[PDB]
Amino acid sequence: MEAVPRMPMIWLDLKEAGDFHFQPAVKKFVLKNYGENPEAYNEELKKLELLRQNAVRVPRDFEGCSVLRKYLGQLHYLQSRVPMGSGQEAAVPVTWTEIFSGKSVAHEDIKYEQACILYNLGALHSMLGAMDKRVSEEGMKVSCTHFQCAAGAFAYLREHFPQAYSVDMSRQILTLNVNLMLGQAQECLLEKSMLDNRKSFLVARISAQVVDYYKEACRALENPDTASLLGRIQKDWKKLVQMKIYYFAAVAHLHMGKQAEEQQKFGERVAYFQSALDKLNEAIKLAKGQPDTVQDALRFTMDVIGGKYNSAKKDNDFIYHEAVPAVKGAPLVKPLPVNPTDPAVTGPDIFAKLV
């Protein structure tokens, strides 16, 4: 199973930005409250304006993540010196497009700009995670890291910002995203654990945790209001996620059977391999119409599991004659921290001189 074709991954689209005309409000505030020439900070203001322009047209690459993190941090630095939050003196309209409806949503609140940038950091990480083939050591590692980073961004958004500036960033939707991203990180970890020839004991537990994350994502996708918001996207995601629940359950029980093989409990071995084959057959039914990438993974796994089940039953029936009978998850991935105000990720405070 170390050589199994890779399943495709889900990613999220980036949100589209509208206007955030901070410059005139900053100048008014500098003149009225800092008592200084309103044109004394034009270099700082142009540097921030250029950074926003870069962030809202971010390249879909690892450098783009750094741009979003830098801009997110500089918005925190600006807010610490000029009050542009809800109801505050220097607040100006912030407009972004809600991604599922295509409608513009405006709030006079710099933290809404921060929220959308952080969302896009999560979305970009999900894209980068889903782009690699996951066949190289560096590619498997970075894909896992990307999905952990995506989970961390959506979780930070959920916990540290006003709730539901727009419905694409509501707590329930962000929780779906976090679970999906952790499930995909755990799937990347499973692939690596099999290439590293970890103990069947551990591989089964890792795969069981993949199932656990995807089951929670599936539960969320079945919620009628989530299904309504995501529309046809919910149909697409649910088909892939529901198939993966059975696929990785089969992978877990395959490795439980291999543990029985190692412990010379050849009756248990047959029972786990039979359960694995039954779960994989359900995954194959659920994969009707899925792309060739999905079909290739399932066919490869059918060759492994079907052949192991057959040989295990033959060995039991004619050699060992053991009774055939009738898994706790290992969460080893976590959302990785955003650290929005660490100077190593933000660089120097653009407005350090405004004091």
Curated annotation (Swiss-Prot):
Keywords: Cell projection, Cilium, Cilium biogenesis/degradation, Coiled coil, Cytoplasm, Cytoplasmic vesicle, Cytoskeleton, Disease variant, Endosome, Epilepsy, Hydrolase, Intellectual disability, Methylation, Nucleus, Phosphoprotein, Protein phosphatase, Protein transport, Repeat, TPR repeat, Transport. One of its GO terms (cellular component) is nucleus. This is Tyrosine-protein phosphatase non-receptor type 23. The keyword 4Fe-4S does not apply. One of its GO terms (molecular function) is protein tyrosine phosphatase activity. It comes from Homo sapiens (Human). Interacts with GRAP2 and GRB2. Interacts with UBAP1. Interacts with CHMP4B. Its main location: nucleus. Disulfide bonds: none annotated. TPR repeats lie at residues 250-283. Plays a role in sorting of endocytic ubiquitinated cargos into multivesicular bodies (MVBs) via its interaction with the ESCRT-I complex (endosomal sorting complex required for transport I), and possibly also other ESCRT complexes. May act as a negative regulator of Ras-mediated mitogenic activity. Plays a role in ciliogenesis. One of its GO terms (biological process) is protein transport to vacuole involved in ubiquitin-dependent protein catabolic process via the multivesicular body sorting pathway. It is linked to Neurodevelopmental disorder and structural brain anomalies with or without seizures and spasticity: An autosomal recessive disorder characterized by global developmental delay, brain abnormalities, mainly ventriculomegaly and/or brain atrophy, intellectual disability, absent speech, peripheral spasticity, and microcephaly. Additional variable features include early-onset seizures, optic atrophy, and dysmorphic facial features. Early death may occur. It is found in: Nucleus; Cytoplasm; Cytoplasmic vesicle; Endosome. Residues 8-355 form the BRO1 domain. Changing residue 202 to D: Nearly abolishes interaction with CHMP4B. Abolishes interaction with CHMP4B. Belongs to the protein-tyrosine phosphatase family. Non-receptor class subfamily.
